[PDB]
């Protein structure tokens, strides 16, 4: 088609319709990489998250209001 | 589940941003679409828990200020 000057302009995003010859090989590695720590996001999220409406009983809060009174 | 809804689109941004040269045009578009879809399914799962069951989620990464 056109002239993309791909001899020396190689940005991280590709530069005018760049698909490397070994794109299938790299795609599987990235898909493995994306999937691997996408589970890591899930494992971290389930451990760290909590319900802020169930941390303290309503009986515990009544004492707080009276004591701070 | 909460970390999946929030940060999965950010991983899709990084992959097409820095690894776009290595996975090509075709696979870069679909992997980013994959990251958004994970946020879609995560959001719908959280929508049922929050709206219909009155459950709140909170993840405190660390202190900022």
């Amino acid at each position: 088609h056109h002239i993309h000057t791909p001899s020396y302009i190689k940005p991280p995003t590709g530069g005018w319709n760049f698909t490397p010859a070994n794109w299938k090989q790299n795609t599987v590695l990235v898909l493995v990489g994306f999937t691997a720590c996408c589970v890591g996001l899930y494992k971290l999220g389930e451990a760290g998250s909590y319900n802020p409406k169930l941390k303290y009983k309503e009986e515990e809060l009544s004492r707080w209001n009276q004591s701070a009174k | 589940m909460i970390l999946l809804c929030i940060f999965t689109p950010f991983l899709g941004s990084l992959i097409s941003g820095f690894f776009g040269r290595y996975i090509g045009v075709n696979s870069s578009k679909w992997i980013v679409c994959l990251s958004i879809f994970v946020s879609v399914v995560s959001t719908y799962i959280l929508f049922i828990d929050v709206i219909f069951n009155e459950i709140e989620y909170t993840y405190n990464i660390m202190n900022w200020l």
């Binding site: 088609h1 698909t19 490397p20 794109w23 | -």
Partner: peptide, 10 residues
Amino acid sequence: DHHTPLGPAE
């Protein structure tokens, strides 16, 4: 067709 050639291996 477009037949966009593939660049060198990366």
